[PDB]
Amino acid sequence: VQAVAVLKGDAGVSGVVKFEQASESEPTTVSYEIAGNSPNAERGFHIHEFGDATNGCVSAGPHFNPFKKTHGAPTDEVRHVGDMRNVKTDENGVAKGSFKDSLIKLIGPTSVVGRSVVIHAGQDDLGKGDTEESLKTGNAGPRPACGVIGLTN
Amino acid sequence: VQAVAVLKGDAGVSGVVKFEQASESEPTTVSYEIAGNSPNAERGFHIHEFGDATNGCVSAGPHFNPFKKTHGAPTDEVRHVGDMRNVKTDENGVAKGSFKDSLIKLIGPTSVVGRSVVIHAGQDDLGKGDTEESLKTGNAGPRPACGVIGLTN
Ligand SMILES: [Cu+2]
Ligand SMILES: [Cu+2]
Ligand SMILES: [Zn+2]
Ligand SMILES: [Zn+2]
């Protein structure tokens, strides 16, 4: 199964996020290309609950968290399903890469198809900050761009 | 269950399409508000296969047609699942309305969540034209705006 999200906004940040999953129990391969970010930085990158673009990136809602866990690092057992790694940006403000993930799926009751991907203006503290906010959003900050995840082939 | 598609493009046409379905076997209520259309006209309006926005409205693909039927009117037994009525535009080029549909669903194997809605520049002939093209697209013409259908609440 394949899916894709086209990240757009008014802040100079834009990109394309691709998803691929063979079957429900297998990892989903997430690959991305994002331009217009701060250079030489780390930016929060997550799957948000709703594929609702009626209000900028606000209507995407909170991080997709069907299991009601706190915000964490991708390799933490306790994390939101939507918690992806911070994306590293080069000297030109470009983030490009790919990774495999076992909580993110394109198939089944927790499918992210119809949900949203959000790229943040700040670094995600992976739930390790000294605030209650760290356990909710990772203090990743504003949402310069986002895109609804649709089915493709 | 609720879903929504935000229609955008570069042709002056834009809008919001809302979807609501209680359970799989029940009708889905589709409501829409679309601005920037030709005034006093009828414009093709359909669910397209892919929620892929990488290439304008082109990457949406063809009409969502899992049952491999020909293009028809909403009330025809033989129609694509994605075949919605032509939307009528007023003197200001605004299309606003709502209807119920039994082939369009937000739940199950034929769910339109993660797919796309496309508003056309031309009138849909409902599969009644004298061409092979009528049975494919209804000769609805260009795609001034489209939007990926995402989950909301
Ligand atoms: Cu986020
Ligand atoms: Cu169409
Ligand atoms: Zn999170
Ligand atoms: Zn059709």
Contact by Cβ (8 Å): A55, A14: no
State the nearest Cα–Cα gap between A117 and chain B, in angstroms. 12
Residue A72, SS3 per DSSP? coil
**Which residue, chain included where needed, has tokens 């990772």?**
A138
Ligand 2 mean position, distance from CA B141 (Å): 8
| CA pair distance A137, A134, nearest whole angstrom | 6
Q: Which residue of A has its CA nearest to B149?
A: A114
| CA pair distance B137, B44, nearest whole angstrom | 9
Distance of CA A30 to the CA centre of its chain: 10
* Residue-wise burial string across B19-45, b where 16 or more C-beta atoms lie within 10 A, e elsewhere: bbbeeeeeebbbebebbbbeeebbbbb
Interface membership of B1 toward A (CB under 8 Å): no
Here the tokens at position B38 are 């030709």
Contact by Cβ (8 Å): B74, B84: yes
Domain that holds residue A128: 1-153
B120 carries a ligand binding annotation? yes
Contact by Cβ (8 Å): B84, B30: yes
Interface membership of A112 toward B (CB under 8 Å): no
A43 carries a ligand binding annotation? no
Q: After which residues is chain B broken (C to N over 2.5 A)?
A: none
Measured in degrees and rounded to the nearest 5, phi and psi for residue A75 equal -85, 5
B79 carries a ligand binding annotation? no
Each as own residue / partner, the long-range contacts of residues B29-33 (CB below 8 Å, 24 or more positions apart, any chain) are B29/B98, B29/B99, B29/B100, B30/B84, B30/B98, B30/B99, B30/B100, B30/B101, B30/B104, B31/B97, B31/B98, B32/B87, B32/B95, B32/B96, B32/B97, B32/B98, B33/B94, B33/B95, B33/B96
Ligand 3 mean position, distance from CA A48 (Å): 8
Neighbours of A45 (CB within 10 A): 26
Cβ-Cβ contacts under 8 Å, A50 against chain B: 150-153
**Which residue, chain included where needed, has tokens 């949900």?**
A115
| CA pair distance A93, A138, nearest whole angstrom | 21
Number of domains, chain B: 1
DSSP structure class, residue B46: E
* AA letter at A12: G
| CA pair distance B31, B23, nearest whole angstrom | 17
Q: At A73, which CATH number?
A: 2.60.40.200
